[PDB]
Enzyme design. Structure first.
Site, PDB file in Angstrom:
ATOM      1  N   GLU A  15      -8.892   3.269   4.476  1.00  0.00           N
ATOM      2  CA  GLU A  15      -9.092   2.308   3.402  1.00  0.00           C
ATOM      3  C   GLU A  15     -10.447   1.638   3.578  1.00  0.00           C
ATOM      4  OE1 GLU A  15      -7.817   1.648   0.682  1.00  0.00           O
ATOM      5  OE2 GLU A  15      -5.687   2.171   0.636  1.00  0.00           O
ATOM      6  N   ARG A  96      -0.105  -9.211   3.999  1.00  0.00           N
ATOM      7  CA  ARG A  96      -1.354  -8.920   4.680  1.00  0.00           C
ATOM      8  C   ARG A  96      -2.437  -8.859   3.621  1.00  0.00           C
ATOM      9  NH1 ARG A  96      -2.878  -3.621   3.597  1.00  0.00           N
ATOM     10  NH2 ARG A  96      -1.226  -2.051   3.358  1.00  0.00           N
ATOM     11  N   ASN A  98      -5.465  -6.907   1.683  1.00  0.00           N
ATOM     12  CA  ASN A  98      -5.613  -5.488   1.411  1.00  0.00           C
ATOM     13  C   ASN A  98      -7.066  -5.192   1.075  1.00  0.00           C
ATOM     14  OD1 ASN A  98      -4.689  -2.810   1.188  1.00  0.00           O
ATOM     15  ND2 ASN A  98      -4.458  -3.021  -1.042  1.00  0.00           N
ATOM     16  N   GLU A 117       5.721  -3.936   0.904  1.00  0.00           N
ATOM     17  CA  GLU A 117       5.498  -3.198  -0.342  1.00  0.00           C
ATOM     18  C   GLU A 117       6.715  -3.279  -1.263  1.00  0.00           C
ATOM     19  OE1 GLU A 117       4.203   0.712   0.827  1.00  0.00           O
ATOM     20  OE2 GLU A 117       2.522  -0.091   1.995  1.00  0.00           O
ATOM     21  N   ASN A 143      -5.202  -4.457  -5.482  1.00  0.00           N
ATOM     22  CA  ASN A 143      -6.122  -3.398  -5.095  1.00  0.00           C
ATOM     23  C   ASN A 143      -7.403  -3.495  -5.905  1.00  0.00           C
ATOM     24  OD1 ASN A 143      -6.160  -1.355  -3.091  1.00  0.00           O
ATOM     25  ND2 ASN A 143      -4.176  -0.594  -3.824  1.00  0.00           N
ATOM     26  N   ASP A 193      -5.233   3.249  -6.677  1.00  0.00           N
ATOM     27  CA  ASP A 193      -5.436   2.604  -5.389  1.00  0.00           C
ATOM     28  C   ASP A 193      -6.655   1.692  -5.470  1.00  0.00           C
ATOM     29  OD1 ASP A 193      -4.901   1.963  -2.767  1.00  0.00           O
ATOM     30  OD2 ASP A 193      -5.083   4.005  -1.991  1.00  0.00           O
TER      31      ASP A 193
HETATM   32  O1  LIG Z   1       5.590   2.968   6.064  1.00  0.00           O
HETATM   33  C1  LIG Z   1       5.389   1.825   5.231  1.00  0.00           C
HETATM   34  C2  LIG Z   1       5.052   0.602   6.091  1.00  0.00           C
HETATM   35  O2  LIG Z   1       3.800   0.819   6.739  1.00  0.00           O
HETATM   36  C3  LIG Z   1       4.972  -0.633   5.189  1.00  0.00           C
HETATM   37  O3  LIG Z   1       4.648  -1.780   5.976  1.00  0.00           O
HETATM   38  O4  LIG Z   1       6.229  -0.851   4.546  1.00  0.00           O
HETATM   39  C4  LIG Z   1       6.471   0.230   3.649  1.00  0.00           C
HETATM   40  C5  LIG Z   1       6.667   1.527   4.438  1.00  0.00           C
HETATM   41  O5  LIG Z   1       6.946   2.595   3.531  1.00  0.00           O
HETATM   42  O1  LIG Z   2      -0.161  -0.108   1.436  1.00  0.00           O
HETATM   43  C1  LIG Z   2      -1.107   0.702   0.733  1.00  0.00           C
HETATM   44  C2  LIG Z   2      -2.320  -0.131   0.299  1.00  0.00           C
HETATM   45  O2  LIG Z   2      -3.002  -0.590   1.467  1.00  0.00           O
HETATM   46  C3  LIG Z   2      -3.227   0.736  -0.577  1.00  0.00           C
HETATM   47  O3  LIG Z   2      -4.389  -0.012  -0.927  1.00  0.00           O
HETATM   48  O4  LIG Z   2      -2.488   1.116  -1.741  1.00  0.00           O
HETATM   49  C4  LIG Z   2      -1.488   2.051  -1.337  1.00  0.00           C
HETATM   50  C5  LIG Z   2      -0.433   1.324  -0.502  1.00  0.00           C
HETATM   51  O5  LIG Z   2       0.582   2.222  -0.047  1.00  0.00           O
HETATM   52 FE   LIG Z   3      -6.258   0.071  -1.483  1.00  0.00          FE
END
Ligand SMILES: O[C@@H]1[C@@H](O)[C@H](O)OC[C@H]1O
Ligand SMILES: O[C@@H]1[C@@H](O)[C@H](O)OC[C@H]1O
Ligand SMILES: [Fe+2]
Ligand SMILES: O[C@@H]1[C@@H](O)[C@H](O)OC[C@H]1O
Length: 287
Positions: A15, A96, A98, A117, A143, A193
């Site tokens: 990311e 958290r 992102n 999530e 995002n 994303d």
């Molecule tokens: O693996 C994933 C985990 O990293 C997230 O924190 O919670 C969703 C899960 O699917």
């Molecule tokens: O947790 C992931 C997030 O970090 C990403 O930006 O979008 C996809 C998600 O699964």
């Molecule tokens: Fe992302």
């Protein structure tokens, strides 16, 4: 053109790629790593983070980076590690940070998300010299914050709602006139994303489950789609000597062992030449 897997890194959640100091910096959120790729030599460097690390931004008149850790916003330098700058949210949320961007005024825009999530507990934040302001709320996975070259349009993504929004961005950093920019109807399991805006104001969106990225005109119409041999593409990043080498992070997260055997370069870093340059990376004004 030809897409190259320049680093068969097999990251869990690649990311937050940025182009800084003529090299590519990015993260593996779930392996808690900061990665650095030098295209000119192929040299690779990795740094362990004490928590999930989700974005990186350089700093005006200072070394190192401001980074998003699950426990808050930190300063990072390879030589000294991590030091807390500020907490943004109640840890009880199991949120958290992102994705993030730096606008042309040195403001750091970053989102938060439910780390699980599932909960609509994520928010959008604007961090500048006046402090940290909450700009949007009630989003499960935020995002792709980004701004247009003229600084008048701000884009933000609600990933699970498959929707990118556009805002009017004022000179004092306020947002107004929110509207749907793009709602994704590219397949049952295709979600937007991370996104960046290129030098022409076009939006490049990495597709989770969509095996590539899509370029969108300022009016919201797809004009180009890039295919990568990786189901989950997480964010584009313009780099190279003239910001015409489009890099992509990808993720093995969410893919079965069967699918990973079929797409073994998942989680790798990909690069493809493109015709329109990206925007130069901006540095955060911490003081
Ligand atoms: O693996 C994933 C985990 O990293 C997230 O924190 O919670 C969703 C899960 O699917
Ligand atoms: O947790 C992931 C997030 O970090 C990403 O930006 O979008 C996809 C998600 O699964
Ligand atoms: Fe992302
Ligand atoms: O329907 C959307 C279309 O308007 C846009 O141009 O490309 C993305 C699609 O999801």
């Amino acid at each position: 053109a030809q897409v190259t897997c320049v680093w068969d890194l097999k990251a869990t959640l690649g990311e937050g790629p940025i182009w800084h100091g003529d090299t590519l910096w990015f993260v593996d959120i779930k392996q808690r790593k900061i990665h650095n790729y030098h295209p000119a030599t192929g040299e690779r460097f990795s740094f362990d983070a004490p928590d999930q690390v989700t974005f990186l931004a350089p700093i005006v008149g200072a070394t190192g980076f401001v980074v998003g850790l699950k426990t808050g916003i930190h300063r990072f330098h390879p030589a000294t590690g991590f030091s807390l700058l500020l907490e943004v949210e109640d840890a009880a949320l199991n949120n958290r940070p992102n994705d993030a961007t730096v606008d042309a005024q040195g403001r750091l825009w970053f989102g938060t998300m439910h780390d699980g999530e599932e909960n609509n507990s994520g928010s959008l934040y604007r961090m500048d010299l006046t402090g940290v302001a909450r700009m949007d709320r009630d989003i499960c996975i935020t995002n792709g914050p980004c701004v247009s070259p003229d600084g008048k349009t701000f884009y933000h993504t609600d990933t699970l709602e498959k929707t990118i929004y556009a805002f009017d961005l004022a000179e004092d950093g306020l947002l107004s006139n929110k509207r749907v920019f793009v709602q994704f109807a590219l397949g049952d399991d295709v979600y937007p994303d991370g996104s960046v805006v290129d030098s022409e104001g076009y939006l490049w969106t990495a597709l989770w489950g969509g095996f590539g990225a899509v370029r969108f005109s300022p009016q919201g119409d797809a004009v180009t789609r890039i295919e990568l041999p990786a189901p989950n593409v997480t964010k584009p990043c313009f780099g190279g000597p003239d910001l015409k080498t489009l890099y992509f992070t990808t993720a093995r997260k969410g893919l079965s062992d069967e699918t990973l055997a079929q797409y073994p370069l998942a989680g790798g870093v990909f690069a493809v030449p493109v015709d329109v340059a990206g925007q130069p990376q901006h540095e955060v004004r911490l003081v």
